[PDB]
Design a protein around this ligand. Sequence first.
Ligand SMILES: Nc1ncnc2c1ncn2[C@@H]1O[C@H](COP(=O)(O)OP(=O)(O)NP(=O)(O)O)[C@@H](O)[C@H]1O
Lengths: 138, 138
Amino acid sequence: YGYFEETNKSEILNTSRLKEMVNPGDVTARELNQKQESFQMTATMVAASNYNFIIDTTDHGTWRRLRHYRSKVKFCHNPDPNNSYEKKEDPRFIHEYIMDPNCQNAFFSILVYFWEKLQKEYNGQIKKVFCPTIESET
Amino acid sequence: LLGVGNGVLSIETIPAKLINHFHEHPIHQYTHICYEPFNPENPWTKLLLNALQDIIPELDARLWIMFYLSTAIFRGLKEALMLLWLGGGCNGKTFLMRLVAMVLGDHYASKLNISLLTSYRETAEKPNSAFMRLKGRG
DNA sequence: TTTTTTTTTT
Ligand SMILES: Nc1ncnc2c1ncn2[C@@H]1O[C@H](COP(=O)(O)OP(=O)(O)NP(=O)(O)O)[C@@H](O)[C@H]1O
């Protein structure tokens, strides 16, 4: 698993690196004071930002790999009762409920259960999951 | 002379011979693949031949591609040729290309960085381990 | 150890 954050305003997505980091194949890199070596690429990627990436290519090899989702709800102080997509925030979620071992292992159990559910429902193929919202937004 | 998983393969004369006995050839590098004589009735051989037919429709193009890729077995001087393969995406390009490197092993085959081919040469003298990967590989 | 690499510069 690998995730990205801290994106600047209107950054350009380097599609050459995209084809190289999400691909069931080998990749080649180098560490400090070390020789070249190659390893399999096996990381799940998530990118979070407040601005849409700039994608300057239209080839099927690029857009078959991308999925886009937009957040609807907002967490703040004094949420407007007229907005269903606005909620009261609880600081503990990031200040405490991310460091407590109990919630961490509960979340790990949830992840294991969902992995088992994916294996037993779609034979492990994420592409077979039905989701109109993600498809429409992408 | 090509080192394989179950001995060493000699392709000096046709048909190729497998050396399962004592020999004095100074051979160190090897691939983990166990060599077996070609057999079209092997289910895996049938599957691979059908996949090759599916990927490359034209017969003459398929024969030329198989002839060019077969020269990877030999580690000596060969014709000054390079193959450029263009595709819209999700069309089996990386499957065959990576399968060739998988069956040749790391000592005889390697993925190469694209910057090694589309970027200016380093200034004067600097160490270049990416170019060093080219030594001894077919 | 000790150096080269890296760093730094292009
Ligand atoms: N003979 C075949 N029959 C059916 N599916 C195949 C065959 N060969 C490859 N595939 C599948 O086709 C998909 C594309 O293969 P892949 O080699 O990764 O694509 P590519 O042409 O290199 N594309 P890209 O790198 O995305 O531009 C993969 O899911 C393969 O498993």
